[PDB]
Symmetry: C3
Subunit: 310 residues, 3 copies
Amino acid sequence: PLQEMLAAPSSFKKSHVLSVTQFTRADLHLLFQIAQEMRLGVQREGVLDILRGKVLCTLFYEPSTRTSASFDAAMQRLGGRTIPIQTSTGETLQDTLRTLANYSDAIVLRHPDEKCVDVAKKYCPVPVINGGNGSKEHPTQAFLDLFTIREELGTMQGLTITFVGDLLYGRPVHSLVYLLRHYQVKVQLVSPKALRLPPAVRQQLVDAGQLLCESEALTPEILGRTDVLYCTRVQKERFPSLAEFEAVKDSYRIDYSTLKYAKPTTVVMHPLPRNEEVAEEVDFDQRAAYFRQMRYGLYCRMALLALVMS
Amino acid sequence: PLQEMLAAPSSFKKSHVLSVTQFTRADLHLLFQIAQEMRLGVQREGVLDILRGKVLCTLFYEPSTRTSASFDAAMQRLGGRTIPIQTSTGETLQDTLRTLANYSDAIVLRHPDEKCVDVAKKYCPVPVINGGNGSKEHPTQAFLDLFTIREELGTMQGLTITFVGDLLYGRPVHSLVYLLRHYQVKVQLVSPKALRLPPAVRQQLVDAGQLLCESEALTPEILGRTDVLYCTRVQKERFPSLAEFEAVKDSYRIDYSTLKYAKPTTVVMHPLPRNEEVAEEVDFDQRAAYFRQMRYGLYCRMALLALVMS
Amino acid sequence: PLQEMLAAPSSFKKSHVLSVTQFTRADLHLLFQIAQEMRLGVQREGVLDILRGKVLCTLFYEPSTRTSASFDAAMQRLGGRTIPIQTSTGETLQDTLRTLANYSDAIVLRHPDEKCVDVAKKYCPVPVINGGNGSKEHPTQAFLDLFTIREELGTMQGLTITFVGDLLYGRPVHSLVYLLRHYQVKVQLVSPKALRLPPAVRQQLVDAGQLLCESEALTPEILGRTDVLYCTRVQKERFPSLAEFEAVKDSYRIDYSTLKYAKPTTVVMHPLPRNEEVAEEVDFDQRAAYFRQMRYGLYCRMALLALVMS
């Protein structure tokens, strides 16, 4: 049933996983199927059998424990072997990739240079998974985000999604807008005017018939119609004047006074790490899904690794 | 026989392991039984079968190779999988614990903040083993210490234990006094007056009918009645005047001129690392047990991991 | 057939691997046999069975991803378990070795002090593999180098080997000269006069009837008779005057204008890392063997680990 679904055909098999723009609605539907199966297999036996004999190497030039350990644990729970590497940007990336390709069957790469995906494509002779390229894309983060929504709420039809915070530099938002192109959702965008979406991402939303509201304020009416409250970090450097920055924090902080205006079923998401824009007092609330996000990311990356490495 | 003893009931199963004050004489007797079995299993097959399908994550905010690699090797020799994380104290500990709990079935945590155990108790949804909380407790170090004594000398009745060095800041001593509450031992305490035991730990000893001698000098008579010479590091910062500090080093240094006054059967212990308070010239001496300590700690942590994770 | 060849007798079994001067022509012939078998086993099943139940610990005091990950991947592909340690030169090496010997069945050690091999011999109770001792020796690098030549060109009789660059501080060259003592090869040595071989290594070559040419220039005639072009890094510190250093770079740089004077079958080798002394424009050329080197090193280290740990 799982050996079945992994028998199926996919763009993932033997492929680099560098951008969400490589994958179709069907690609992701199959992936999410396999991720449900992965969750069942693990719930019963802990470490499965899919990838005995396969070696994954993780190559992180900047540390991101959530992502690197997620891939480590996914590979090992597939029954594969992992080689975790920590380094910093003097040997070039293309030399390191070609070095490590001789040891492993695939590499997860996170690197401060967004052109790293291009280097990986030109030089690396094994599949590379893009674990973050200068903060431009992080495709499995987009995957696990979409999956989180599906899993927590059921069908995508009818949903209203509210992105809050820094939507200019918040690329996980942009990647997720792309993945939502296939769905009859409405979207609200709460941000200062200085940090609205890039005009082309906004244009992606109006083109799909999805842009509902744009607002600088996180209001009880916006909150009352939110099925999904996807928050982003808002860093002080994005503002010239500190006063502005704190005004915007206090406005956007998800705490109990903010959740009271929400729905009983509102899913609160966050790619993490967070500063104070989601209060700790909310972590135990059923609607707080940002730790369940990471267990969903476990099952999605098991599926992705199974598909890429057969 | 081992599947038998792991069938048995214990406070360890599914529990946080944060303090020695959580465990009874029976708890530790069972643990030591299982540790003897672990040593046999490993002596014959290297990597056992107990914890296939289980994932342990080690989370060390300060490096301690002896402890982190001991737990890595214990888990893997149980047939489980390990995810070793190195980080430093900006994401909070409770967020990191909840992140990693989605990947592993338990976490070993070492952290500079002694309140970390409380954080782990409030937030973490998988068992946490306390690998050292701001140097206040290190329970498996206490376990392997008691086990070391048992293993090297047989029965605890009749023993004289001599703690030497810095007994104020030497908490492994305090934890071990607690674990020795059950035993008819006598204890000698050699330290400067500035670094005697905390009055309550001393009071724990007189209450048990165990305090034999307190001395600022490491004397041939104290040495002649020592079954166990447990040394601690003496750091220069614990003294205002350098002269005092070196006087105390030279007095307490375990070398050949000091061992000659000891028994042929005196077990010399040290939690490690050491500076010069145990001379290298003594390392090959049969009585030098501070490297055998760590192989005993291997078997004890295999037992503890087997019990906690079933 | 592999269980056969590992049944055979070898100086490797249970031995420290510290110097090329420990091993005979037969030792290396057997090793290369087993490495061919390792390549076949892995090509069909990924992770083999040879060393289930064995634990290897890697202990690198300076990072060298190519070497540490090569040994990690070799052990794991033998079916053993690995414990990778990263540290820096306050606990002594002999204390760390004795600590870790209680957890693993062998240790790969790389350390800035060339005397580390002596420390390892005096104190460590498990086999130690020398992964680099203050840049004096790196024996498995020599092994994989010789194997690379054999594999790419067939029989050693008739070959001309040309070492280029910094032959004084290039010890992999010296180790490889030693390993070539058994073979009817000719050797050319291209280097500035300031960086010729040590007189005793040169004397090793004339004693074997092998020194063909010594030159400060990399000439079309030297290139035309090169079967193996083994390049070394040339670092700016080896020259007082920058002008000299760049003159020597430009002279020695392997690029297309330099390869045109070579043979169609010239194997270009490099221990790596490289600066600019092999141009990127050459990496895709069939003759560029410095990434295949590392896959050969994978199979050689699998063989060496299998032999040392039975």
